[PDB]
Amino acid sequence: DEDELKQKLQQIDKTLNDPAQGSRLEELWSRLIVLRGYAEDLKDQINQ
């Protein structure tokens, strides 16, 4: 039954260890920081 275990493990491990899936988060973070800076600037501007 070990084969099935390592099969599942390999499947999920393969699903996790992907360039795109891992990259999406990193891209998202910066993609958030953009809005962070933009919002903070636009906020400071309309901070009256």
Partner: protein
């Protein structure tokens, strides 16, 4: 201060938010013209009120 700034921040280019100043100006100009023409109608009526006596 920085905590709230990061909490209320949006992921978007900053040069686009400042641009909204143009839209806001285009939307304020209308009301400003309406105030011009109302203070003008007012002035006219006033001068007529000073013409009749």
């Amino acid at each position: 201060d920085v905590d709230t700034y990061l909490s209320n921040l949006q992921t978007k280019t900053t040069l686009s938010m400042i641009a909204d100043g143009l839209e806001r100006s285009a939307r304020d100009f209308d009301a400003f013209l309406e105030e011009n023409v109302t203070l003008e109608w007012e002035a006219q009526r006033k001068r007529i009120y000073q013409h009749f006596g």
